[PDB]
Write a protein that binds this ligand. Sequence first.
Ligand SMILES: *[C@@H]1O[C@H](CO)[C@@H](O[C@H]2O[C@H](CO)[C@@H](O[C@@H]3O[C@H](CO)[C@@H](O)[C@H](O)[C@@H]3O)[C@H](O)[C@H]2NC(C)=O)[C@H](O)[C@H]1NC(C)=O
Ligand SMILES: *[C@@H]1O[C@H](CO)[C@@H](O)[C@H](O)[C@H]1NC(C)=O
Ligand SMILES: *[C@@H]1O[C@H](CO)[C@@H](O)[C@H](O)[C@H]1NC(C)=O
Ligand SMILES: *[C@@H]1O[C@H](CO)[C@@H](O)[C@H](O)[C@H]1NC(C)=O
Ligand SMILES: *[C@@H]1O[C@H](CO)[C@@H](O)[C@H](O)[C@H]1NC(C)=O
Ligand SMILES: *[C@@H]1O[C@H](CO)[C@@H](O)[C@H](O)[C@H]1NC(C)=O
Ligand SMILES: *[C@@H]1O[C@H](CO)[C@@H](O)[C@H](O)[C@H]1NC(C)=O
Ligand SMILES: *[C@@H]1O[C@H](CO)[C@@H](O)[C@H](O)[C@H]1NC(C)=O
Ligand SMILES: [N+]
Ligand SMILES: [N+]
Lengths: 326, 205, 212
Amino acid sequence: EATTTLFCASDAKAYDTECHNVWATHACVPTDPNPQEVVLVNVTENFNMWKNDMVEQMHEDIISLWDQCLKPCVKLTNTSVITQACPKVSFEPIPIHYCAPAGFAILKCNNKTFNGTGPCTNVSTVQCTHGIRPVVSTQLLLNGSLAEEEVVIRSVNFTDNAKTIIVQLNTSVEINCTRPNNGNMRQAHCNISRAKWNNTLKQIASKLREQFGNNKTIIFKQSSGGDPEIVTHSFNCGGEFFYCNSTQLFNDTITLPCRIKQIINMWQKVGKAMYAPPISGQIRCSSNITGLLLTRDGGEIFRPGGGDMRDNWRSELYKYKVVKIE
Amino acid sequence: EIVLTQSPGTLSLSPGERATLSCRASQSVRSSYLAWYQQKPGQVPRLLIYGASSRATGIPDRFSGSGSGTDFTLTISRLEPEDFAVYYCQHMYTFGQGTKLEIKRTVAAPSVFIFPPSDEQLKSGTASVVCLLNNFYPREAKVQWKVDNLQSGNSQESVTEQDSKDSTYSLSSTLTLSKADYEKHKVYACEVTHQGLSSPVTKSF
Amino acid sequence: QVQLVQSGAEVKKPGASVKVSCKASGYTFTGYYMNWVRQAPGQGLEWMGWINPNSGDTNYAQKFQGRVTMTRDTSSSTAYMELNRVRSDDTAVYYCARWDWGQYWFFDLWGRGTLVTVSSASTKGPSVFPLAPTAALGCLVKDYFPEPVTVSWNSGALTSGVHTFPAVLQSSGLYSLSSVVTVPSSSLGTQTYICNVNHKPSNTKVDKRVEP
Ligand SMILES: *[C@@H]1O[C@H](CO)[C@@H](O[C@H]2O[C@H](CO)[C@@H](O[C@@H]3O[C@H](CO)[C@@H](O)[C@H](O)[C@@H]3O)[C@H](O)[C@H]2NC(C)=O)[C@H](O)[C@H]1NC(C)=O
Ligand SMILES: *[C@@H]1O[C@H](CO)[C@@H](O)[C@H](O)[C@H]1NC(C)=O
Ligand SMILES: *[C@@H]1O[C@H](CO)[C@@H](O)[C@H](O)[C@H]1NC(C)=O
Ligand SMILES: *[C@@H]1O[C@H](CO)[C@@H](O)[C@H](O)[C@H]1NC(C)=O
Ligand SMILES: *[C@@H]1O[C@H](CO)[C@@H](O)[C@H](O)[C@H]1NC(C)=O
Ligand SMILES: *[C@@H]1O[C@H](CO)[C@@H](O)[C@H](O)[C@H]1NC(C)=O
Ligand SMILES: *[C@@H]1O[C@H](CO)[C@@H](O)[C@H](O)[C@H]1NC(C)=O
Ligand SMILES: *[C@@H]1O[C@H](CO)[C@@H](O)[C@H](O)[C@H]1NC(C)=O
Ligand SMILES: [N+]
Ligand SMILES: [N+]
């Protein structure tokens, strides 16, 4: 029941000029030819999403990716300033397999309705985890994994309001974001189905009602305040950062307004960073919403959360634990 | 745009002395995706080290790779006459320019010889006179062809590998020219310059 | 018996397509990646691509993308690689290696190697010329194609002091080399010397004599 260094693995193409593919070629090995998935019968082991080392490993690997592969022209910190060159490149998330090292293996809870902390009835050991697209997003979750059975809620403590609440989507909700060329290039927009989103939101509301018995008809609202990275739906699309306003979602064809920001609050450290002007023409990005990051206002009223990308990796690495062979 | 630069370009050492080859990478490379191969002249590259610092299955103990980050090192203590070969530094897909290793030896004098073209060759329309420098160690000798008082652009030279027996090199330079211009001139000479040679030895016919 | 057997040497013209096959026998074919590496004559190594024999997904470098196509045959346990728009720069020795998926990246097995030669000239046999005269004596193997040539002295009887120099390509595209030997005067006068030149690509055996 120990922990050690893992190594990334992905079926990356060495000839493509997509940023992710470059770093993968020279920092991650190809995929395992034969997948060794063994189902252990009558095994009970306690998993813990939040005190897991795999999350910090994935966090560290991603940090290096963005730096070496999506570099900022001007970085800003209270103490220091660093100026450098940032060449424009393409950027489309690819899947990454985080394999366990020779001598160790990963235990996998193979039941959808697993809360995240506690014993698992059915556990299966696999040598490599499944491909996890490393998408950095705020508020919303994108290109993620869907819950097989039904929507699931996960958190360290429903009693403590400060702790974030993570939700895994039931059916992938598609969102199609584009900045069309006419003028003012910042103005953009995302489009999302109104009826589909309303149904998914009602489903999450029902799950939250199950968490808090009496089922006080609750309503969602925009984040109170703070830096715009957590208040607004932010995500990287086509190499340019988009800060889309999620005011319509939390309350026809819903359409959100977006704005390409040059300066943004970087999540690697405590500081700011600036990037070059935007690309001139059509930018197209269509992703599958597969969950959300929400927090509870004390007093139930819920507001979007996020900002700390470690939770996103927990959402994807919740059923996986690294242990030693016997 | 990653390139592994191996240094030194050409290392020269004698048996018994520990030699260290360095391989520097532009970007900070992963710690466990590094390997070192040895290729003896005219054979398939042999796998010496893998994982930066780990002897492969069966590799002798004297070999030892080490180093992390952008700078890596391949160490060979107690050089034996068989370890003197080409060494390459490989990180996943990118190989290094290569590092040529040579057995140190005392400077030897170049046995200079010049051979005329066979009469049968002149009957074909071309003429090839050969100038041979045999058994000389430094590897940097220069052979100049001059019809009495200089030629250029038509002299092909070839060097043999390190002689296995006496650890010395041999060079043969051939300058081919037409037959008409051959009969036109009369004084052909081959000058040789070499450290071990006090003066530039000139052999001619 | 756990061997990586490659195909024989090939001679191609500019613009043709070359296909070299690497057959592996003795170990489980599908379970290990098959990598293709080439080495130009007298230069460093260069990885070209690899193929996953189990699933068949391939990977090539940017320099090759578009004109290299890799295939595998599970039935006969072989892996073929094809390279289109061949050019003089592609002349090299192609090796194939086997890597079993793991933490570390390394080439455990190496094939004997396949020699691909690309040039305009056609296959031509060598022309042997004597270099007549402790003195020396040698022979000149001039105007021959392709590269593979072997020189022996007195049918393998003479060995000591022999030096066969690496071939050099002439402006006409035909290679040329020289093989010389050092012989004292007594042996040069009492013992006859002959050059045995074998150019297998053209099935050319030559036995020339050298005398003062
Ligand atoms: C999750 O999944 C999507 C891919 O499966 C991905 O998609 C989109 O993102 C990229 C830009 O990030 C677009 O890719 C571009 O396509 C244009 C048009 O050919 C290229 O010219 C351009 O250089 C680049 O390849 C994708 O085309 C678009 N998906 C589709 C169908 O168009 C999502 O972005 C990803 N989620 C997140 C947050 O990135
Ligand atoms: C598992 O999660 C459920 C809520 O979905 C909760 O009732 C239960 O107490 C949790 N058990 C443990 C050990 O965390
Ligand atoms: C979780 O809530 C319980 C009280 O219900 C408390 O005992 C425990 O200390 C809390 N842990 C955290 C991290 O809030
Ligand atoms: C994005 O727009 C709609 C859904 O909002 C749909 O047609 C499709 O998912 C996307 N459009 C195209 C051309 O792909
Ligand atoms: C969630 O999935 C279950 C079926 O497994 C279904 O009962 C429920 O209606 C689904 N809700 C949504 C929004 O898909
Ligand atoms: C988002 O939209 C609402 C109404 O349009 C507005 O009140 C709010 O200030 C907007 N927030 C941002 C960051 O644009
Ligand atoms: C969101 O709901 C509030 C009332 O609760 C309303 O004022 C506002 O107009 C709504 N926004 C949209 C886009 O419908
Ligand atoms: C600079 O100042 C504050 C406090 O020192 C800090 O929280 C912030 O992260 C730093 N970077 C900024 C404001 O861009
Ligand atoms: N996968
Ligand atoms: N962001």
